[PDB]
Design an enzyme around this catalytic site. Sequence first.
Site, PDB file in Angstrom:
ATOM      1  N   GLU A 168      33.811  -3.109 -26.195  1.00 22.16           N
ATOM      2  CA  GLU A 168      34.845  -2.221 -26.743  1.00 22.16           C
ATOM      3  C   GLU A 168      36.233  -2.853 -26.656  1.00 22.16           C
ATOM      4  OE1 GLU A 168      36.339   1.825 -24.900  1.00 22.16           O
ATOM      5  OE2 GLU A 168      34.864   2.226 -26.485  1.00 22.16           O
ATOM      6  N   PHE A 191      20.856   0.556 -30.356  1.00 22.23           N
ATOM      7  CA  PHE A 191      20.194  -0.059 -29.218  1.00 22.23           C
ATOM      8  C   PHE A 191      19.679   0.980 -28.241  1.00 22.23           C
ATOM      9  CE2 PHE A 191      21.117  -4.652 -29.791  1.00 22.23           C
ATOM     10  CZ  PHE A 191      21.883  -4.544 -30.952  1.00 22.23           C
ATOM     11  N   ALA A 192      18.408   0.849 -27.869  1.00 19.27           N
ATOM     12  CA  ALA A 192      17.785   1.762 -26.914  1.00 19.27           C
ATOM     13  C   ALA A 192      17.005   0.927 -25.898  1.00 19.27           C
ATOM     14  CB  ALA A 192      16.894   2.753 -27.629  1.00 19.27           C
ATOM     15  N   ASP A 219      26.115   4.069 -30.849  1.00 16.73           N
ATOM     16  CA  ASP A 219      25.422   4.322 -29.589  1.00 16.73           C
ATOM     17  C   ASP A 219      24.287   5.319 -29.794  1.00 16.73           C
ATOM     18  OD1 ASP A 219      27.315   2.694 -28.353  1.00 16.73           O
ATOM     19  OD2 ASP A 219      27.922   4.223 -26.897  1.00 16.73           O
ATOM     20  N   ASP A 233      23.025   7.483 -27.269  1.00 16.60           N
ATOM     21  CA  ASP A 233      23.140   8.682 -26.422  1.00 16.60           C
ATOM     22  C   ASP A 233      24.007   9.739 -27.111  1.00 16.60           C
ATOM     23  OD1 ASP A 233      25.298   6.833 -26.008  1.00 16.60           O
ATOM     24  OD2 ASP A 233      25.805   7.735 -24.098  1.00 16.60           O
ATOM     25  N   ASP A 280      33.080  14.292 -27.727  1.00 20.78           N
ATOM     26  CA  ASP A 280      32.351  14.698 -26.535  1.00 20.78           C
ATOM     27  C   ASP A 280      32.805  16.114 -26.204  1.00 20.78           C
ATOM     28  OD1 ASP A 280      31.415  15.203 -23.925  1.00 20.78           O
ATOM     29  OD2 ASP A 280      31.598  13.101 -23.349  1.00 20.78           O
TER      30      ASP A 280
HETATM   31  O1  LIG Z   1      20.640   0.621 -20.180  1.00 18.78           O
HETATM   32  C1  LIG Z   1      21.217   0.670 -21.276  1.00 18.78           C
HETATM   33  C2  LIG Z   1      22.606   0.599 -21.387  1.00 18.78           C
HETATM   34  C3  LIG Z   1      23.217   0.660 -22.648  1.00 18.78           C
HETATM   35  N1  LIG Z   1      22.438   0.796 -23.823  1.00 18.78           N
HETATM   36  C4  LIG Z   1      23.042   0.863 -25.205  1.00 18.78           C
HETATM   37  O2  LIG Z   1      24.463   0.567 -25.132  1.00 18.78           O
HETATM   38  C5  LIG Z   1      25.175   1.739 -25.599  1.00 18.78           C
HETATM   39  C6  LIG Z   1      26.498   1.890 -24.822  1.00 18.78           C
HETATM   40  O3  LIG Z   1      26.272   2.260 -23.474  1.00 18.78           O
HETATM   41  P1  LIG Z   1      26.613   3.757 -22.998  1.00 18.78           P
HETATM   42  O4  LIG Z   1      26.179   4.720 -24.039  1.00 18.78           O
HETATM   43  O5  LIG Z   1      26.055   3.884 -21.644  1.00 18.78           O
HETATM   44  O6  LIG Z   1      28.211   3.696 -22.883  1.00 18.78           O
HETATM   45  P2  LIG Z   1      29.147   4.978 -22.663  1.00 18.78           P
HETATM   46  O7  LIG Z   1      29.015   5.920 -23.957  1.00 18.78           O
HETATM   47  O8  LIG Z   1      28.543   5.847 -21.436  1.00 18.78           O
HETATM   48  O9  LIG Z   1      30.550   4.560 -22.440  1.00 18.78           O
HETATM   49  C7  LIG Z   1      24.194   2.890 -25.358  1.00 18.78           C
HETATM   50  O10 LIG Z   1      24.476   3.999 -26.205  1.00 18.78           O
HETATM   51  C8  LIG Z   1      22.921   2.268 -25.837  1.00 18.78           C
HETATM   52  O11 LIG Z   1      22.927   2.293 -27.301  1.00 18.78           O
HETATM   53  C9  LIG Z   1      21.048   0.868 -23.686  1.00 18.78           C
HETATM   54  O12 LIG Z   1      20.356   0.988 -24.684  1.00 18.78           O
HETATM   55  N2  LIG Z   1      20.441   0.805 -22.427  1.00 18.78           N
HETATM   56 MN   LIG Z   2      27.413   6.027 -25.328  1.00 15.63          MN
END
Ligand SMILES: O=c1ccn([C@@H]2O[C@H](COP(=O)(O)OP(=O)(O)O)[C@@H](O)[C@H]2O)c(=O)[nH]1
Ligand SMILES: [Mn+2]
Length: 282
Positions: free
Chosen positions: A240, A60-61, A148, A150, A263
């Site tokens: 989660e 998801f992006a 994810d 990121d 990480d």
């Molecule tokens: O504005 C947003 C928020 C979340 N995500 C998706 O939801 C995942 C989980 O959110 P995030 O990575 O922020 O969670 P974290 O790793 O910081 O706990 C992200 O990797 C994306 O794949 C997105 O696409 N847009």
């Molecule tokens: Mn993430």
Amino acid sequence: FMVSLPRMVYPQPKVLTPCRKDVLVVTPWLAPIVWEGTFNIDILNEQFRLQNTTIGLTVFAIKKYVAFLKLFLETAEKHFMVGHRVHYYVFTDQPAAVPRVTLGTGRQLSVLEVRAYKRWQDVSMRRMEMISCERRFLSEVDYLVCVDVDMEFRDHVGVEILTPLFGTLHPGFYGSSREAFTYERRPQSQAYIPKDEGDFYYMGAFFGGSVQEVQRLTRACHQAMMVDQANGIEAVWHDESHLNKYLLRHKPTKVLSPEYLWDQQLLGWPAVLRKLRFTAVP
Ligand SMILES: O=c1ccn([C@@H]2O[C@H](COP(=O)(O)OP(=O)(O)O)[C@@H](O)[C@H]2O)c(=O)[nH]1
Ligand SMILES: [Mn+2]
């Protein structure tokens, strides 16, 4: 039906010598825990190629997170299931912002337009409803992997992970006692897990399995989230928390070590990790 493996020459596994002595490599329900040194990738590649395995990867992006796709996809091309059939499914609110990444043979990408929720919590959580696309996956892939965006691949992520149902050890909790796990602790939530329960803390950022098992998991989590919403409660760590409840009650058939979700900025590179395979982007 499975044809015979070909003749292969490789080192004999020795019964009276463990591959790894420093870590747990099998759960108490006899699911392998996947660490470097526990698998011969040549044997596994043969087993899975002989089945003409296709792996779907969902990502998801949404909103600003489209910026992460280029590195995610380029590095997936270097490290994810190379040699096998791969179908990426990019779920996004901005189809025109998806980078044109060059793909290897036998690999394809589909852009699926979804709605963007205001709250990042909802964006993250609502991934369960979207994955639960049901008819499409069954016809197109054998396994689904849900990650994810990121993130970047830095090393091999391959068929060693494939199994009916897997979760990944969260890198912040693999050495923690269960009372320290950030499970949902309010009994009013469907995600609730008491202090004396829990095997592992699994990360929402990497789970998967067969299409059938992944759709069971995502349907169950989405339904549980809807019950919580009706009851005016939001689990502490969103989908989660629900993923953790599901995997407590439906044991995964493999568990990935934190090599598979790391990480380096927050946690460095401990000796117990021989490889850093899939890592957070700052
Ligand atoms: O504005 C947003 C928020 C979340 N995500 C998706 O939801 C995942 C989980 O959110 P995030 O990575 O922020 O969670 P974290 O790793 O910081 O706990 C992200 O990797 C994306 O794949 C997105 O696409 N847009
Ligand atoms: Mn993430």
